[PDB]
Amino acid sequence: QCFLIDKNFVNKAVESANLTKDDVVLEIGLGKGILTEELAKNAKKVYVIEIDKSLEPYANKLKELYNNIEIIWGDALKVDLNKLDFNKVVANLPYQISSPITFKLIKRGFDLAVLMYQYEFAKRMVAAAGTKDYGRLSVAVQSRADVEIVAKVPPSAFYPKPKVYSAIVKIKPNKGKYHIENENFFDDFLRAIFQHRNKSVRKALIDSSKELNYNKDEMKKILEDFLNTNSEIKNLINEKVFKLSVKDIVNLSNEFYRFLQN
Ligand SMILES: Nc1ncnc2c1ncn2[C@@H]1O[C@H](CO)[C@@H](O)[C@H]1O
């Protein structure tokens, strides 16, 4: 249990969330309620999902001062987020749940999130194409949202003191930017190519053909056929996986899905 104890980083997170009294905020983790209090002050209402019932006295004290806090006791990975009406998410995330929670939240949808991650995880999220930290996580996030690191957060800001830095990350979903033909196929396509990130897209797809439910020979012939559709496709699939931009991977998988359909 890491608790964010530096009010200055609370402030930075809240300021970045651009809150008004029309906003409804989901917070993951109660902690000592320091972030919770700031959210309650500035938002219409705050939902807090907290797993540890020993923290109830913090919740209880807060609810005496604020009438717009609702506590949900449970695991945030299990809570049905469809049943909650919020537009923003602000949280010092338990790092253990970083990846699954991020995608469950984006799936549900929101206007804006400002979330604490471990610094290396944050770097991967925001990494530019063709760089050393660019990978599946980068494309999976950036294809669905604009993301940026607001601030690096030192271990001294938490208690107990962590081993590594954290980072505040701002996430603005953008449902219109890249346009995805089929989410399931896109997820499988991403999983296949990034299993071989230093190979050409062509070779990655053949090596990991079973992820897309084709055999290796089938996949070879498919890609021979696919490459002959246009010159843009040829140059994309011949390029190393990690060098393709998010835009290019989305378009490529879109064109590939339709090719496989037709
Ligand atoms: N899976 C989880 N769901 C909800 N809250 C959690 C989970 N794991 C840890 N927490 C809580 O989040 C906070 C981490 O800062 C702590 O209050 C901790 O109890």
UniProtKB/Swiss-Prot annotation:
Keyword S-adenosyl-L-methionine attributed: yes
GO biological process: rRNA methylation
EC number: 2.1.1.-
InterPro entries membership: KsgA/Erm, rRNA_Ade_diMease-like_C, rRNA_Ade_Mease_Trfase_CS, rRNA_Ade_methylase_Trfase_N, rRNA_adenine_dimethylase, SAM-dependent_MTases_sf
Job of this protein: Specifically dimethylates two adjacent adenosines in the loop of a conserved hairpin near the 3'-end of 16S rRNA in the 30S particle. May play a critical role in biogenesis of 30S subunits.
Binding sites annotated in the UniProt record for S-adenosyl-L-methionine: 4, 29, 50, 75, 92
Compartments, record wording: Cytoplasm
HAMAP family linked: 16SrRNA_methyltr_A
Sequence similarity: Belongs to the class I-like SAM-binding methyltransferase superfamily. rRNA adenine N(6)-methyltransferase family. RsmA subfamily.
PROSITE patterns in UniProt: RRNA_A_DIMETH, SAM_RNA_A_N6_MT
Protein keywords: Cytoplasm, Methyltransferase, RNA-binding, rRNA processing, S-adenosyl-L-methionine, Transferase
Protein's recorded name: Probable ribosomal RNA small subunit methyltransferase A
Organism from which the protein derives: Methanocaldococcus jannaschii (strain ATCC 43067 / DSM 2661 / JAL-1 / JCM 10045 / NBRC 100440) (Methanococcus jannaschii)
GO CC, alphabetical: cytoplasm
Disulphides: none
Alphabetical list of SMART domains matching this protein: rADc (SM00650)
Xref: NCBIfam families: ksgA
GO molecular function, one term: rRNA (adenine-N6,N6-)-dimethyltransferase activity
